[PDB]
Design a protein around this nucleic acid. Structure first.
Ligand SMILES: [Mn+2]
Lengths: 84, 99, 106, 95, 97, 76, 104, 91
DNA sequence: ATCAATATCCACCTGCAGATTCTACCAAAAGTGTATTTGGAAACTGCTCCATCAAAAGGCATGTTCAGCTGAATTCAGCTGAACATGCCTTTTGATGGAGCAGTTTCCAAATACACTTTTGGTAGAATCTGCAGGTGGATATTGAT
DNA sequence: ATCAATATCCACCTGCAGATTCTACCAAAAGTGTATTTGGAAACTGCTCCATCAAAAGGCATGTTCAGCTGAATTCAGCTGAACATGCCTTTTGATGGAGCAGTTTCCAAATACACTTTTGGTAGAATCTGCAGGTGGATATTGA
């Protein structure tokens, strides 16, 4: 395929903006964008790590939605609508 | 005129707008790449179910939207209307994510 | 003839399923006969509560079909249901509109 | 090679008609519903197991479910819960 | 006469307490409080002497903690005096309210 | 009774907490939240005792209740 | 001949295995599980005792008290993470004072 | 009756710190720690079993659970000891 | 920044009692030997679902301009909360005693568990429906310049 | 005090992607006939848990003084929002190949089930012991001059 790298910049500024708006924020400092990305990247890592761990226990090469869900549950971030 | 909207006016308009809709704010394709990149580093050659990537994106967006509200309250609390990394960092500190 | 156990208790939810799921769940070694019904009834009720509040939301919005948004609103507007589902996130739920007092114009 | 997985879908729907005959629910919303049912189901049973275990009981009585409900459900919702259950049980035993 | 400037003892207090682990709240009043609260839920109850400790340990531990968070909010607003306003935020952020 | 929780005690608690300056309003406020703590912990605690049928609240009852509240406790 | 000596552990493997059965955690308990868990529980204890020792030794006491334990747990980043939600009785807090509070 | 891990913790304490001793209260704290972890590892382990439609908990299930519950070095060392004790026990 | 005069901590010292740890032994478990069940690893292989790639296209992300108004800096002072010497009473603590009451037994009638056999109630395709998503337009604000 | 300028609102429109129904099998409840437990249900302790009762002594409540902390008001440098212009690339749509779930089967390696025999770990005394706890005597940290 194609090598993947520095895709964390995929999370654009407008989009981070939009997420903040829905959060009710009217004014955003410029440093926010990069900081947000940082937090987002950490969230994903932690949740994907567990997720994939559930996948590794199953021996499946595919991460099902459940994997993600069980993962989120451990993280105390329960999700409704995908696998249970 | 050119007709122009005073600063902050549009922001208020966006806030009302995005709060009413439920669609995902982050662009689907780029998120997917990010998710696939991060996951590739933990385990090589993994495969993701269309539904699995969505699940991840829903939780993320939800987390961030949530973090922003708290952050906003930290900004309002510090007498400022502008959110700042100083706020986000505090908010997570209180949340306990990383004291 | 033949009667469903749920009908005996007059519930819509499946008591047989609830009982069997309690057995297979390893929650306990013995599952009383009253527990499955009791439980099955509790969920049915909670389901009707949630469905009730959503319905209106659908009508409030002139929709005859319940979508997630309505559920989120239902769950977040009611103080108690909110509490019970405080840690949870509904996919596509969006958020209760709310702009901070200070942020408004003047 | 069918692979039949079950859900509370049928039951949620019946209940949806009871509260609002004219209203209907969507796929995405149904899923949410099933999750709610399942989540709550786990809380009560899991929390019920604790009661039993804490008291060295080998069996989960309909009574343990009730005590779990009190702890798990808040306020009026809890009260109604207990009411609907007991009703169901009292009716069941008496038949 | 000699008087300690304001805030000096405070810091002397802070350094002193963090060093000791003994519970700060008076035991009997507390136990009196606990029983009172317990009665609304159930009457003529009895508590293991140890049961009260658990309760007291938890509360002081929680209260001490709440303040750490309270301070950060007070510090964060450019102040050095914790206010009810700060306490609510910390709790609102925590999810308690 | 809740007034048993004296102002100097609360001040002490805050110290260990790292506070240097306390508004005079906190106290009632520090008192209020406290009252709530017990209300929630004890309530769940007793429920456990009642299920048990005992007329005495063991140290254990508290532990179980604390865990349910998320505020886990060690040593009892 | 204790199964624990076979695995070379101080903790009771039998106890853990009997505990796993009465726990309702599962239908059947593998033979390797008990030793593994038991084993893992041993190490963790080892880890915390060692650090408390230091705390104790550092404090000049030959006997460990809760404070030593709390000091040990909280100073270590990873142990803190694992027991973040837990609270030790008589643990007190680590001694920390905000920079700004200090005299300028 | 009334069994505790108190006896076992002491032995472990002695290896690392022969010179040191532990108070009664601290012992209790240690027993609590052991129990929680025990419950925490077993719980998860159970879930791994259920999620995977397994009816039995292998040592592996205990391990995978350990990777989720413990972080970084604590996990690594923790996982090692388990496998090590198991490999030795089976021999 | 010292000088000096308070008040504080702070090691060096040192005495017995509330704890710790070591003993001395007995039911509870754990370890064994046998004899059976059975869970799920290995071995196919049907066949969704996931990865990919090609194409057209407009939804949007980027960069740049500008300048409105927010964040940060200052300055001031009214007044809130620390430091304190004061005077007094609720918390300590320490038995002392009696009893409400956890905690044990020991049967056992009621309730569960099992083992098989019927009997529907569900679930997974199809055949049929129909809210409503995606547009269009006027009426209705809400804004921001004068 | 005006009014264009622009965005926001609400009802009408209408095929179609996402329900609602409609049906046939069959996985799993329901019905029955026994084979075990289970958790009570009276009796009874040994105890932890209330109750006083009784002195004293920290520890708490107060009224005082005023030091410096929080708020309010004034400013203005420039950070960040609102507009456009540009054209990149995320979306949409659909086609294929085939990796890799998953449903079946097959059956040993492993775990469960008793019947006993042994060894251990919890208790209650019995013999040590670290600190609590004061108690100097001496820099140390504060603050005013
Ligand atoms: Mn990479």
């Amino acid at each position: 395929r194609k090598v993947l790298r520095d895709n964390i910049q995929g999370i654009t500024k407008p989009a981070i903006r939009r997420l903040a708006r829905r959060g009710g924020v009217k004014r955003i400092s410029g440093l926010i964008y990069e900081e947000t990305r940082g937090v987002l990247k950490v969230f994903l890592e932690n949740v994907i790590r567990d997720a994939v761990t559930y996948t590794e226990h199953a021996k499946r090469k595919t991460v099902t939605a459940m994997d993600v869900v069980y993962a989120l549950k451990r993280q105390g971030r329960t999700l409704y609508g995908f696998g249970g | 005129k050119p007709h122009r909207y005073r600063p902050g006016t549009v922001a208020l308009r966006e806030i009302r707008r995005y709060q009413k809709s439920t669609e995902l704010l982050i662009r689907k394709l780029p998120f997917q790449r990010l998710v696939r990149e991060i996951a590739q580093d933990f385990k090589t050659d993994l495969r993701f179910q269309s539904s699995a990537v969505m699940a991840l994106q829903e939780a993320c967006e939800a987390y961030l939207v949530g973090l922003f509200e708290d952050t906003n309250l930290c900004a309002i609390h510090a007498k400022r209307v502008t959110i700042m990394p100083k706020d986000i960092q505090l908010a997570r500190r209180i949340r306990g994510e990383r004291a | 003839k033949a009667k469903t156990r749920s009908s005996r208790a007059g519930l819509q939810f499946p008591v047989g399923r609830v009982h069997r799921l309690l057995r297979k769940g390893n929650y306990s070694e013995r599952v009383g006969a009253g527990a499955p019904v009791y439980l099955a009834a509790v969920l049915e009720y909670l389901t009707a509560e949630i469905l009730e509040l959503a319905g209106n939301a659908a009508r409030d919005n002139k929709k005859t079909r319940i979508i997630p948004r309505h559920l989120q609103l239902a769950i977040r507007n009611d103080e108690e249901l909110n509490k019970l589902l405080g840690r949870v996130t509904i996919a596509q739920g969006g958020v209760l509109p709310n702009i901070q007092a200070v942020l408004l114009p003047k | 090679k069918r692979s039949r997985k079950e859900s509370y879908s049928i039951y949620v729907y019946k209940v949806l008609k009871q509260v609002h005959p004219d209203t209907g629910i969507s796929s995405k919303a149904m899923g949410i519903m099933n999750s709610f049912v399942n989540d709550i189901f786990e809380r009560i049973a899991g929390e019920a197991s604790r009661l039993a275990h804490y008291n060295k009981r080998s069996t989960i009585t309909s009574r343990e479910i009730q005590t779990a409900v009190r702890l798990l459900l808040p306020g009026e919702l809890a009260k109604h819960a207990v009411s609907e259950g007991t009703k169901a049980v009292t009716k069941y035993t008496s038949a």
